[PDB]
Amino acid sequence: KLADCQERDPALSELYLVEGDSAGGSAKQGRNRKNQAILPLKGKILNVEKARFDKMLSSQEVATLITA
DNA sequence: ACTGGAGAAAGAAAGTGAAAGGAAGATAAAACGGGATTCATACACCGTTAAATACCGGTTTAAAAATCCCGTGGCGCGTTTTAAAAAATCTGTGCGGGTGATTTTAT
């Protein structure tokens, strides 16, 4: 789901987080593809304050964010 | 000749799809054990009598009970271990409005 940029210098790159695919589609068409990236999420995210470490690890959105 | 960037080769480390097999499950056929009938047949209850046994009086005697000395092991005390049961603390889950997403078929 990641739409990456073309710059290879991390000090000149940006990342945007959006709520879902409907917002991501609109964001990808108006961005500057040279040094901007878009990563869509899915709904409300897990509350890590009330959860456990294994429960956090078993999540999918958190894993995708960590990988990104 | 020399320098530094860039592309291509070559080599080594990590991820991968496929692998007997075995303990761990699961599912049927079989052997079992516990009720409803059906009587014939052996068992329960009632008069009669010869016989076997219980009981009394007095011995006795051999065996068991009572008594004394002693020397030990089997209970008793104090202090540790160790499972077992109980109290305390975590883990899921569903109720109803909200946010955002997935898949298979025909022509």
β-strand partners of A58 = none
Q: Which of residues 45-64 of A touch strand B (CB under 7 A)?
A: 52, 55
CB A54 within 8 A of CB A32: no
- Helix or strand or coil: residue A27? helix
* Angle of CA points A25, A30, A31, to nearest 5°: 100
This PDB structure is determined at a resolution in Å of 2.3
Question: What determination technique applies here?
Answer: cryo-EM
- Helix or strand or coil: residue A62? helix
Nearest nucleotide by C1' from A1 CA?
B101
Residue A10 DSSP one-character state: G
